[PDB]
Amino acid sequence: FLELWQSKAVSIREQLGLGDRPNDSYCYNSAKNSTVLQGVTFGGIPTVLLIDVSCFLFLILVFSIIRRRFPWLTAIFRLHDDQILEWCGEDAIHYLSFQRHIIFLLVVVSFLSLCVILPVNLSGDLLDKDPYSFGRTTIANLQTDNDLLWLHTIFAVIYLFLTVGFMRHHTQSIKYKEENLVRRTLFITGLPRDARKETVESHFRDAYPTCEVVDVQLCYNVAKLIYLCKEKKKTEKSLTYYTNLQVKTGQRTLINPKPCGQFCCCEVLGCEWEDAISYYTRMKDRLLERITEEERHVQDQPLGMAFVTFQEKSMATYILKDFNACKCQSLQCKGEPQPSSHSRELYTSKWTVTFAADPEDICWKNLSIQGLRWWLQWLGINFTLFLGLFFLTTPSIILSTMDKFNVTKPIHALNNPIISQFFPTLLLWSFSALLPSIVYYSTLLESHWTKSGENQIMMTKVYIFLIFMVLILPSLGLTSLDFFFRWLFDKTSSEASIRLECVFLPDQGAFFVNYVIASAFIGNGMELLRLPGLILYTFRMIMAKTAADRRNVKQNQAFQYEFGAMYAWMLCVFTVIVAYSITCPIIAPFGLIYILLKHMVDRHNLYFVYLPAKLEKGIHFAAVNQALAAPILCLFWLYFFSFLRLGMKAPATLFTFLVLLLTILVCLAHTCFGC
């Protein structure tokens, strides 16, 4: 077993083929006393799998040590599906129900596919019948002008029925009704600077005499006011803490105002030490002067928006569903707001009214970036984030595929199986794990307004970036790179043109399998251990003023579960698994094992220190409709693969075009007139 893995197998391929193909002449036939360069021995999956198993065992041992100082499989064997309801939160029940639904769907599709898809992939002769190859089970060993794609298409479209049925069953199980009765206030923008409260109330009385308004909340430029209030609150908290420390100890302390100034232990210019109390009083007085000036400066300039509240609901909806495209009749028909003498200078046509959330948590300090400045910030921040993402995906792929830049030397005695298979996967996974922090900082800089939509837009952006970073971007990247080595290696200007009938993802498309295994074993162990949560905890313990100050660290050691980040991560993994189900079916059992391990790890971690949820059901609905879109992406990827492998002349391409057209046609009916 162990002997016939890399000792004898590496020499079998070196003494076969020898060319002389009578009439087939399949792609990647032979070479100069060697095989093709793209030929990889099973993708090197056994060695990396064994290394991951050993590292997971070591990480389990160190986790047991850390738990002892702060196996325990009996707990996992003991937990049931009731105590969570008796003592934990309510959203945990729905989270576990969704997890059960997804694992059931994955196991059902795996058991339905692993018995039928494998023989049809193995029934091929394009890979010269390599015994220990890995690409024989993928679409690479498929005949072009053959009718085996009909079963593939039928099963890929029964994906649609199965997923829709499972999602509908999950929706009926959660059975949450709509409860969003917050419509007493309408958000109106585009207000001219000249118009006043009297003007707007007179306009409202002249337009709609069937309602009453007792107060108008016209927004001001008090975003700077709230920012100064937050800075003053932080300064007061620091001053109170240092005063308490002074009372407790009796000695003066010195601080360094420069960022990261705690490491300046020597007399270095730029790291001067100043009295904490006197300095705190200095910025306290400076901030006091700033707020005193800005309070008088508040009325000098408005922002162009106001809040108008009501007392009833039917009248409020009647007026809130009148003079904008979405609320009025479909396809932007002529809207007729009530005319008056105060419309030309108020720009009712240019007005845009949307739903308003609870004013208690609305970010007042983040309301000064409205107008075209919002679009400018979006196009200047997310675009440069995409540029940085391009820079991030450039060299992970570059170093992962550094052994195929040279088209000569088919001996393939230079590549090291250990390298170029674990390190690139690890750095890509680490960058993916650090991406939520970068997107969190980007969102904080962007300063979204509505708290009720903060989590929704955060999860949407995280999922979009994760997709365009791991699924569609790297795939197209290495496909283009493989086409590049094809163009400079195989049949370019010798006797014919480029042959596109045998192109595929290099390394037998094992990069995604390696990523899945890394997120399944070493990534799962890393997530359980919380390597950078541990780093942050160690840094927090290191930074201090006294020795016995363990009271304030245990109060914030526990952290809220990142619902949006975890949902986006799991949904991205499931979508990539679904999309790469027609391609590389061997990834299905690996994904099943990953889901099993993640289920066990989440069940174990949801009982020790994890806090109960405080989040609403809109996130659950967003997750449901996000999981609903996976088969659409799978069909799109199938169409892309069909177009890349075969030309449009075949009727199969026309059939795929028609099915894609119908799927895209039924995609927005739930958005235009749906809720």
Swiss-Prot record:
Keywords: Calcium, Cell membrane, Disease variant, Endosome, Glycoprotein, Ion channel, Ion transport, Leukodystrophy, Lysosome, Membrane, Phosphoprotein, Transmembrane, Transmembrane helix, Transport. GO terms for biological process: lysosome organization; surfactant secretion. Monomer. N-Glycosylated. One of its GO terms (molecular function) is osmolarity-sensing monoatomic cation channel activity. Glycans are attached at N33, N406. Residues 174-372, 447-451, 543-562, 608-617 are cytoplasmic. InterPro entries: Csc1-like, CSC1/OSCA1-like_7TM, CSC1/OSCA1-like_cyt, Csc1/OSCA1-like_N, Nucleotide-bd_a/b_plait_sf, RBD_domain_sf. The keyword Zinc-finger does not apply. Signal peptide: none annotated. It comes from Homo sapiens (Human). PANTHER family: CSC1-LIKE PROTEIN 1, PROBABLE MEMBRANE PROTEIN DUF221-RELATED. The gene is TMEM63A. It catalyses: Ca(2+)(in) = Ca(2+)(out). This is Mechanosensitive cation channel TMEM63A. The keyword Transmembrane applies. Changing G509D: In HLD19; uncertain significance. The chain crosses the membrane at residues 47-69, 91-123, 148-173, 373-400, 419-446, 452-488, 511-542, 563-580, 585-607, 618-645, 651-665. It is linked to Leukodystrophy, hypomyelinating, 19, transient infantile: An autosomal dominant disorder characterized by marked hypomyelination on brain imaging, congenital nystagmus, and motor delay manifesting in early infancy. Both neurologic impairment and abnormal brain imaging spontaneously resolve during childhood. Residues 1-46, 124-147, 401-418, 489-510, 581-584, 646-650 are extracellular. Residues 511-542 are annotated as: Gating helix. The lineage of its organism: Eukaryota, Metazoa, Chordata, Craniata, Vertebrata. Mechanosensitive cation channel with low conductance and high activation threshold. In contrast to TMEM63B, does not show phospholipid scramblase activity. Acts as a regulator of lysosomal morphology by mediating lysosomal mechanosensitivity. Important for the baby's first breath and respiration throughout life. Upon lung inflation conducts cation currents in alveolar type 1 and 2 cells triggering lamellar body exocytosis and surfactant secretion into airspace. Also acts as an osmosensitive cation channel preferentially activated by hypotonic stress.
